[model samples]
Target: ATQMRLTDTNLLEVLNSEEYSGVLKEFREQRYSKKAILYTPNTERNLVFLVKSGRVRVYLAYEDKEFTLAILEAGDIFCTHTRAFIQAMEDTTILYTDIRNFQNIVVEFPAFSLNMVKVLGDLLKNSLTIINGLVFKDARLRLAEFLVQAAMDTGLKVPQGIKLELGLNTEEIALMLGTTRQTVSVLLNDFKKMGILERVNQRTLLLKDLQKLKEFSS
Candidate 1:
């Protein structure tokens, strides 16, 4: 097997030089299999993860039901704050750092904390946007927005268009959008008719026309 070497770029590069050094020293590599849960609701763990590779889904679970929160991929950071951390919904590879160590590094290097605050602020704003969309937008519009956002964030750009892997099923999408699987199926069919997206495989979505999709989202 080939060894994966960790580099300064792999560590959060937005941190100050000194803080980056500290993070590089304490960072640990960890991998999880598909459907593995990293955290649970109301359960507190003082650790943050940097996704080096693979995809991770963060979701909320109550009773036997799950609500998809976000699908994060390479170059994404998860669990920045103790409050916003949630459970994982898929296989992931991450660089785990303890909260205490993260804070200490911030204290010793102010730039680290500042960069962290910025990142967290953006994340919070995006979360609020999604919440507002759910409250105000119709299910179909919300689904459109979700598709466009997902494509921009995690899709692979190909010669034809943006290709997105449908890492979750219809039920998962319904859970995230606060809708039903039947509604999701209808919306997907509508998009397919419009030529915005096509089912590439059982577990993949090919975004045939991102521009048109964005117009639909608007």
Candidate 2:
């Protein structure tokens, strides 16, 4: 048999062209309205969720605060449970399957299973990156890291820089970095003053000095 690798991380993309695996024939599906809690720490690891639509917020909890691990939108496959809390951020649809049958899926759908592993690896990598930022990095560097990610997540490339067309506001972003909204605003202004960033408006940001911004993250 030929080896498989990560071609697509989207579950739907991976399975769209594949023959249906009858193994999932007896799986489960759940619908949650926005703001519903899907999974919490210590919850049973039963099935991974394949988000059909809407958003899921995977969060890492500290003593009294939470930092977002990742905001998984449509086409993202998240874990069954452990170490994080998964919440339905928007009205969401989740297609799930028993943990016992997951291996069977690997056998029946090699490429798609490879995609699953890719998604898992990505989520793990993101979670660890957030943890590493909090523990070993300074506040300003963490904010710099967050700025770069925001640009990549929902920004468009322009000669000026990347224009963030749509995204969370400073408050949400601050929560994502486990920092205060005021601090986030302060650093963003600090970047502007240094000419590393250009703010077009309250919600619009352009990273004028991506290399310099990346240096801070580094």
Candidate 3:
């Protein structure tokens, strides 16, 4: 899906600042359920979003395949532009500001605007970095790095292990990481045998051995 995503980085700092708190009061609130499309390539441009809760996935499509770009959650801010669409991977709540109002806020609050540029520019780097890692990293290391990132970003405590959002599948993971399904399938089984990770369930991943995963990643 296509939308700009701002992380829980310094953007929150500016938002919490006295200068921005009042400005945020005018944002329009919205909610979406599982698989709901939030923005399409043709939606109004230059919108800003503040995610309140739940999960969203953004991706880019190739000829017959798609590459997962990023996963966004609460406290995240995203944007809208031409060509990309965003979808709720699960039920979600968010605050959105249309182009005119937000940019007006940008003009009125220069400090917030400066910080906003820094924040948005920083987010644009993550997806490209993932792609660069795939090209440079070893096949095995790619998956290892991916899992660790998933755990860090979306993992939750469950009786079985670290549960990841069921947003993406192994096939999708394989596509995103630039590897074959066989490569992904074998790594999981191999990790399970090595006691490093476990397939918790269809939509969840369990990391049994963080140290092993790290060692392989590097």
Candidate 4:
């Protein structure tokens, strides 16, 4: 079977299509402060929400441990039925509606539904990547694998090398890789010493040598 990838247009594009203008009229808007909790598996209401502005995090936790599922940004969409804790990473504006209404519209708009399939594909692929790292890799290899994946998915070209604009902190990286923040920080420093990566700022990292990073992943 052929692989499914995001089409040229995403869910936001489909939602804004001229043919779909009336669709937004049904969605109510809400604002969330930074660090505000949005939903958990235990939440009674199920709603489909679009991140109109700012970032949101979805993750799962077991006792004291946690694993980030995704960091949704502006234009991203999510439904509350998923068994994950949802929280605002920053002040955020969201537009949402009940799942019943969302499902009805999906049936009405074939094109919209097609885009939704792409979204699911992306999410599934990300989960598989994390699982692969967790099941097979040590701390160093896990971080290397994550960096390589992030570079491939969202890296930008620059004179120095590939630039990753992930604004995640060491603690967040630790949670994502099932390691400690100290481990993440130390491993990153090791990468820096090896001259394969460079921390450009709190929000960006430059991949000085992609081949070396890939080698470390193995």
Candidate 5:
């Protein structure tokens, strides 16, 4: 696939399409710093977020430990868990749409409603895929899957290959994958040794070969 750039104009172009026009007005912009929580359990806020830039990690907490659910980057939309509002796992900027406005858009515009159904359906399908992978795959495979998904969703294709502008450390990545930080560190280091990825900086990841990483898929 050819490299594509994501910009405000491109985003607006997406929203301006006939299928999305009516729903565009409902969205509002929001920004947050690193480690900022966008939602908390037991809170009732009906909103969905469209990431404009930066990263957001969605996870569930139990027994004082948080399990990584997903990592959302630019062009990703999340927080569609009914009344459960989403929280940021890091410094992030997102476009938020309230449930009331969402509902109104659906009711007022049939095309928009159909478009929403398509979007929601895709989300459901991807969520199921992730859940199934977690249930059946080992830690290394699971982590590789996460890396592949991140590369597809957020990577910037360059002459050097695909690069992910991740803002989380290895420990946080482990938390998202339901594993210990040590495990994440080891696996990532293994990838680095294999030349599949390299640390661009403390927080950035340079994916050297996506096809090589994809070989880890079961």
Candidate 6:
């Protein structure tokens, strides 16, 4: 059997493993409409979820403002008991079980616990990166770092450069970077002129020079 990484790309492999047969039977499927609020800090639910399909947004909101903590895609795992709210970014499917049940599964399958640690480490690292950028970086540097990460995580290779199809608009991006939409717009144009990045379309960007982007970010 292949080593389980517990990501959207290889969720099926993990679920199909012999040890996971019982785990699969324990999950209950649920669906959400676009923009549906799935979890909030005040909620009493103690469930953990696997994003079976579509996108989910995790964010913090106060009054009229919000900050994006993460945008989880298919196969991502998240716990509902958190300070942030989880919302469906699109029509989404989730497979979930209670925290108590999950704890039992972890105790029963040591391999599953190891993979959970790996994912939690990744989540923690990304949170630190976001916090570091927000506290110490300027708009230009923040945008540069964000572009590099987005490219690495989701970009595709193309003749021109690294093709990034960000399924987010300027306002949403501003929330992620802890900046304003106007700032993101201006910095993007600056990068465009410098040949570090190119706007292929409203939702698509081409990273022309990763080295330059990285240098600017740092």
lDDT winner among the candidates? Answer: 4
Can you write out model 4's per-residue Cα lDDT over 78-131, one digit (the tens) per residue?
A: 888887898999999999998888888878977656655655665665565456
lDDT of 5 at 192: 71
Which tens-of-lDDT digit does each residue in 1-218 have in candidate 2? 11123553455665554365564465577899999998887566667667878989988777967766666766666675568888989999888876676667767766656655665665665565555545545777888877777777776889888887435678877888888898777677657755688877666778888776786676
Clash number by candidate, in order: 0, 0, 6, 0, 9, 0
Q: Per-residue lDDT tens digits of candidate 5, residues 1-218?
A: 10222222334346668777657667889899988877775456667667777877666566744445455666666665543335666678888887666666557644444334444554454455445445545888878998899999899988888889878888888888898787777677767755689898877899988997897754
C-alpha local distance difference test of each model: 0.65, 0.70, 0.69, 0.79, 0.68, 0.76
- Tell me which of candidates 1 and 5 scores higher on TM-score: 1
TM-score of each: 0.47, 0.58, 0.50, 0.60, 0.44, 0.58
The list of candidate 6 runs beyond 4 A from truth reads 1-9, 137-218
Residue lDDT tens for model 1, 1-218? 10121233423454425535655677788888776766654355567666766776665456754444555656456664433334444566787788777667657754444444544554554455445545545887888889999998898988878888868888899899999888788678766755578888766788888986786576
Candidate 1 clashes between residue pairs 3 or more apart in a chain or in different chains: none
Q: Which ten residues in a row have the lowest lDDT in candidate 6?
A: 1-10
Error of 1 at 127 (Å): 2.1
Q: What is the C-alpha RMSD of each candidate to the true structure, in Å?
A: 11.8, 10.8, 11.3, 11.0, 11.9, 10.7
Better of 4 and 6 by TM-score: 4
| Cα shift from native, residue 152, model 2 (Å) | 20
